[PDB]
Structure formats: C-alpha cells, structure tokens
C-alpha cells in the first residue's frame with residue numbers, strides 16, 4: 001500500500017467555546033473552535049478508560065485519511081483526559097431524523113440528490129479501499145438540505161474482504177450476517193437499505209422482526225417492500241442492491257450515474273403528493 005501521509009491535528013482545549021450537548025447515551029457536544037490568532041470561529045461537534053481511547057483514536061485515524069465533499073471532515077483531536085473527536089458541525093442533524101421531521105416538505109429532487117451524494121461519498125471511500133460497515137440513514141449528516149455527508153467511521157476497515165462482535169443486522173448483507181464477510185459490495189447492500197429509509201421518510205426496516213430472524217427471512221428470498229412513492233425504476237435499483245450474488249449488485253460508480261439521470265427528471269421517478277462576524281464553516285477553513 002501507499003504511505004498514509006495524513007496529518008493528525010492536536011487541538012488545545014482552550015480553543016473551544018460555547019459547548020452545549022447535542023446528544024448522549026459517549027456524548028456529542030456542539031461548540032465553536034477558535035484557532036488561536038486566526039480571527040475565525042469554526043462550528044464543531046465534539047465526541048467524547050483505555051478501551052474507549054483506543055476505539056476513538058481508530059476513528060480519528062480513518063477520518064484524518066479521507067477528504068471528500070460527501071465525507072465528514074475531521075478537524076482534529078483533543079487530549080484532555082478522554083480523547084475527544086472534533087469534527088465539522090452538521091447543523092441539520094442526521095438524515096434519519098431529518099426525513100422524519102420534514103416528511104411533508106421533502107420533494108423528489110432532494111431525495112434523488114441525496115442518493116447521488118451518498119453514492120459519491122461511498123465511491124470515494126471505495127477508491128480509498130475503505131469499507132464503512134455501518135452505512136445507514138442515521139449515519140448521514142445534513143450540512144444543508146442540499147448537502148449531506150457520510151459520518152460515523154467507528155466500524156470502518158481498510159482493505160478482498162474483511163472478517164470480523166455486535167452489528168446492525170437489518171442493514172447488513174446476508175454474507176455479512178452468516179459468515180461475517182464485509183466488502184464494498186456489502187456496503188452496497190447497506191446503501192440499498194439506506195435509500196429505502198429515505199424513500200419511506202424514516203421507516204424502520206423489518207419493523208417488529210427480531211434481528212435473529214433476519215438471516216432466515218433473507219434466505220427465503222424476502223426483501224423490504226416497495227415504498228409508496230417509488231416507481232419501479234427506483235425500487236429495482238434497491239432490489240439490485242439486495243442480490244445474493246455480491247458481484248451482481250450495482251457498483252457505487254453506477255449508482256451515481258443512474259440516480260443522477262433520475263435527478264434530472266425527479267417527478268418521473270418519485271411520486272410525492274404536493275411535490276410541485278468571523279464564523280467560517282470547516283469546508284472553507286483549509
């Protein structure tokens with residue numbers, strides 16, 4: 001492989017301010033990163049034992065090694081006690097909560113554009129030989145309603161397959177459930193489930209079915225149902241992401257092309273009723 005010359009930035013605790021809690025259950029805070037002597041305020045998210053410190057530094061390693069407009073930005077780490085992961089603040093939350101809270105106001109243009117942007121981010125990760133292993137609507141953050149990015153690389157592995165603990169069964173490819181193989185094509189399966197989440201405005205996949213039953217359901221040939229707004233063109237793409245033969249599933253490069261074609265005439269492919277001073281974003285602080 002090539003030498004990973006990415007830079008790991010160490011940030012002083014004295015450079016962070018206005019810290020409020022965004023969510024917990026670790027904890028994630030919202031705040032402002034003010035680099036000393038820079039006249040710049042960066043809206044940031046701050047994610048917070050030896051085992052906890054090892055895993056958070058693994059995610060810091062991954063996020064420092066990726067740079068793409070549709071992959072979340074790592075700004076640095078802070079070595080205060082428990083290691084803190086400092087990333088770009090995405091002020092509209094995760095896509096899962098966003099489609100649930102704004103169902104009655106999301107048109108076909110936004111849905112298909114999100115599918116394009118997620119596929120662009122995953123295609124970049126594939127270029128970097130990175131398998132996400134946890135692609136889901138909850139792990140796609142919203143910078144603006146027109147710009148989303150993939151997040152949460154706690155399970156990501158650099159690669160061929162990966163052989164592996166606890167995992168999101170209802171988003172995993174069948175070969176990942178049965179024999180624990182993870183590939184870029186197993187990520188494609190998760191992409192199909194993620195699209196199904198968006199097209200259903202936040203429904204839970206296999207709602208009410210225990211995770212221990214998912215592998216037997218998938219082996220029988222059963223899949224997630226066709227969402228009401230989805231034409232057969234869109235649902236066919238999702239079904240192709242859920243093929244048994246991993247090499248028969250679409251490639252991320254191909255998902256970009258197909259969803260971009262659809263985004264040029266979105267109402268032909270999604271049928272939705274009523275469809276007709278010194279603050280600097282991290283994307284501009286290079």
Ligand SMILES: *CCC(=O)Nc1cc(Nc2ncc(Cl)c(Nc3ccc4ccccc4c3)n2)c(OC)cc1N(C)CCN(C)C
Pocket residue numbers: 022023024028030045087088089090091092093094095096097138141151
């Ligand atoms: C799906 C939950 C969620 O993402 N909520 C959220 C997120 C942000 N913005 C943001 N920006 C960057 C990063 Cl790294 C994060 N990280 C994060 C991960 C997991 C998580 C779980 C629960 C709550 C927050 C959270 C954050 N997040 C944001 O910016 C304003 C707001 C929200 N909220 C408040 C959605 C509502 N909340 C889930 C109750």
